[PDB]
Coordinates of N, CA, C and O in Angstrom, one line a residue:
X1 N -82.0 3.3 -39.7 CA -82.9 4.2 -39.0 C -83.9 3.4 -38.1 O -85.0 3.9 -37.8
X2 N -83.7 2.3 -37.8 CA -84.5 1.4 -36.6 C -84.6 2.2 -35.6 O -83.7 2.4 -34.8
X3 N -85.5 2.6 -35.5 CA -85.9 3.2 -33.7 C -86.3 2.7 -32.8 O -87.5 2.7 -32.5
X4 N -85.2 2.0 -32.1 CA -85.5 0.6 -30.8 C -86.2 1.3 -29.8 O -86.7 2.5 -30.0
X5 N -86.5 0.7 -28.6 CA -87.7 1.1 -28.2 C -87.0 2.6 -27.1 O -86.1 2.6 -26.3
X6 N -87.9 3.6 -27.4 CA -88.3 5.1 -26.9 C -87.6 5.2 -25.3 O -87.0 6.1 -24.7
X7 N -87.9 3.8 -24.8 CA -87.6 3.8 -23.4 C -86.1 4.2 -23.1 O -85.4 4.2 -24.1
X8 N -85.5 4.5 -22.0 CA -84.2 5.0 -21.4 C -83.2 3.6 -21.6 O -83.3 2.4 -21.7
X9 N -82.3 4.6 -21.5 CA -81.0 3.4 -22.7 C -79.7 3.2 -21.3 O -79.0 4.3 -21.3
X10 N -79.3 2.2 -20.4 CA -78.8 2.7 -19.3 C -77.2 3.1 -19.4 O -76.6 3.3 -18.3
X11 N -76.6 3.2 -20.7 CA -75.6 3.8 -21.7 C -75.7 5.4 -21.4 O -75.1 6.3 -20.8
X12 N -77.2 5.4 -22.6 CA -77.5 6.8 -22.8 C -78.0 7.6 -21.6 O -78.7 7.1 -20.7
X13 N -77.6 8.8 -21.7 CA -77.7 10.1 -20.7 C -78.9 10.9 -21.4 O -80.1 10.9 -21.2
X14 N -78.0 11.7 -22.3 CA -78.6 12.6 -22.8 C -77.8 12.8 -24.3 O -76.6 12.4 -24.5
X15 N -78.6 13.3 -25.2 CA -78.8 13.9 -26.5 C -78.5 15.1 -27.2 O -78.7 16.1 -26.6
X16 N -78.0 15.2 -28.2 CA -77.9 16.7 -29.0 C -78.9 16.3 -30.3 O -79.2 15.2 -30.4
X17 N -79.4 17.3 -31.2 CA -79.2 17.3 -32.4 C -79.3 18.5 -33.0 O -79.3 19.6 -32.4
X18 N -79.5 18.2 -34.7 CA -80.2 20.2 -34.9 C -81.4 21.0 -34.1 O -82.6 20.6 -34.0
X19 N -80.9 22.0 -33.7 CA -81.9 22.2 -32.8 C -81.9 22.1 -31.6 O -83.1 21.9 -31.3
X20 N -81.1 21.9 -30.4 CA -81.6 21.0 -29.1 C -80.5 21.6 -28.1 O -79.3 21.3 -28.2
X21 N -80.9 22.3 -27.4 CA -79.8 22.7 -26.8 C -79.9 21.8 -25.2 O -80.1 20.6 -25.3
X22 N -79.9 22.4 -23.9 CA -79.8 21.5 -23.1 C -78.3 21.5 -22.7 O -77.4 21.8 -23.5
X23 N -78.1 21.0 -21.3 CA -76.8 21.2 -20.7 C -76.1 20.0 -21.0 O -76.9 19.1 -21.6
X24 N -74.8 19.6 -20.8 CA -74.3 18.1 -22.0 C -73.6 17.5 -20.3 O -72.4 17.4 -19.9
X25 N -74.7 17.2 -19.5 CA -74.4 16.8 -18.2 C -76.0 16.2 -17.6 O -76.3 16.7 -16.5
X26 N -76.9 15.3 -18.1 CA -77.8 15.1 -17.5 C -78.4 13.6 -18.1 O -78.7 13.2 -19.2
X27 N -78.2 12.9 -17.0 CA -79.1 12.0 -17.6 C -80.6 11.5 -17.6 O -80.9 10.5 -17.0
X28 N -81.3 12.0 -18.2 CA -82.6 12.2 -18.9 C -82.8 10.5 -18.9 O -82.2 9.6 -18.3
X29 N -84.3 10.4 -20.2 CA -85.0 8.7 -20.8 C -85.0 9.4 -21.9 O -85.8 10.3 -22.2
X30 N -83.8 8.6 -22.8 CA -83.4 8.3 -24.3 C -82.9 7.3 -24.7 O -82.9 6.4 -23.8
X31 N -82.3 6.9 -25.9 CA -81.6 5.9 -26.6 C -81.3 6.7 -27.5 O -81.9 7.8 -27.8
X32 N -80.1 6.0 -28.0 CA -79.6 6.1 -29.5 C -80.1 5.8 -30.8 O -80.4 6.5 -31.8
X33 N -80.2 4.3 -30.6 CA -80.7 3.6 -31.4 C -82.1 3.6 -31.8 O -82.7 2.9 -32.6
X34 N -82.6 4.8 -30.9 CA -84.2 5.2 -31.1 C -83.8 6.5 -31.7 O -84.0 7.0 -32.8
X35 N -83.3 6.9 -30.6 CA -83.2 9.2 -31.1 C -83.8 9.4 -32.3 O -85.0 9.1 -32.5
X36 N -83.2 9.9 -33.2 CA -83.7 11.0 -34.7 C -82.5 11.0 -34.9 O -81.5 10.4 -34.5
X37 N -83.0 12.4 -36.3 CA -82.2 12.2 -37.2 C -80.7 13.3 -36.9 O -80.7 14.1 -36.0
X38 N -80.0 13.1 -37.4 CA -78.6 13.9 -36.8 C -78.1 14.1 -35.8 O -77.3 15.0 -35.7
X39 N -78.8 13.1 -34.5 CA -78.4 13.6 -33.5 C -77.3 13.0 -33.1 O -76.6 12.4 -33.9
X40 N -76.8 13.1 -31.4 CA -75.7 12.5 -30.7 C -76.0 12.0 -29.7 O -77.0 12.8 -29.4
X41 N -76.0 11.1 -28.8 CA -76.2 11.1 -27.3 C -74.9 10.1 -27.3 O -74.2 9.4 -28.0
X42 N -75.0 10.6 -26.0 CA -73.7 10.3 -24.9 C -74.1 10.4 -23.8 O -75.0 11.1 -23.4
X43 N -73.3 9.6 -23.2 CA -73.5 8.8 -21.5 C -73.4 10.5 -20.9 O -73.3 11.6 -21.4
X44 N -73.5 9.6 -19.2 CA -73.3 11.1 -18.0 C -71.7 10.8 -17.8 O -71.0 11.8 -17.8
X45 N -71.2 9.8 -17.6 CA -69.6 9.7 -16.9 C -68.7 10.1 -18.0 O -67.5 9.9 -17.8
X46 N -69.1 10.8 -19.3 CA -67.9 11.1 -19.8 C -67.8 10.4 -20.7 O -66.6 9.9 -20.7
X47 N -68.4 9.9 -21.7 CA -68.2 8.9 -22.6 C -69.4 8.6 -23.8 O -70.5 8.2 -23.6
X48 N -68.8 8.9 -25.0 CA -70.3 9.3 -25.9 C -70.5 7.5 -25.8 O -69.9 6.5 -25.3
X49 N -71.8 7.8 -26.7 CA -72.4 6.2 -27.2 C -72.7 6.0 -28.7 O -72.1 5.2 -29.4
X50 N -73.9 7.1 -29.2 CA -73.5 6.9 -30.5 C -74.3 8.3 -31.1 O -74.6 9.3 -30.4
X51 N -74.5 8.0 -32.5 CA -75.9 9.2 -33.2 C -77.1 8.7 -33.3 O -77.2 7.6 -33.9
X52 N -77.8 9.3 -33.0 CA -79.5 8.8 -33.1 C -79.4 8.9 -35.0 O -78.6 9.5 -35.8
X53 N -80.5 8.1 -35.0 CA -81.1 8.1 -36.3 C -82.5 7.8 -36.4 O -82.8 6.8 -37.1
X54 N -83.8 8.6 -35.7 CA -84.9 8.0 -35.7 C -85.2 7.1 -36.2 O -86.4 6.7 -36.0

């Protein structure tokens, strides 16, 4: 549950988790290795990266 730093991840796009809706086409400022708990993020080209774990 290391939450690397908050800043935009040039992998990461965008995010799901419980709760979070949002279109699954945007690249936003997140990380994975930062996110929370249950989430997902995945790139914009088509290609996940990993699950957040705050």
């Amino acid at each position: 549950m290391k939450a690397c730093t908050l800043n935009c991840d040039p992998r990461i796009a965008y995010g799901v988790c419980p709760r979070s809706e949002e279109k699954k086409n945007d690249r936003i400022c997140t990380n994975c290795c930062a996110g929370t708990k249950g989430c997902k993020y995945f790139s914009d080209d088509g290609t996940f990266v990993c699950e957040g774990e705050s």
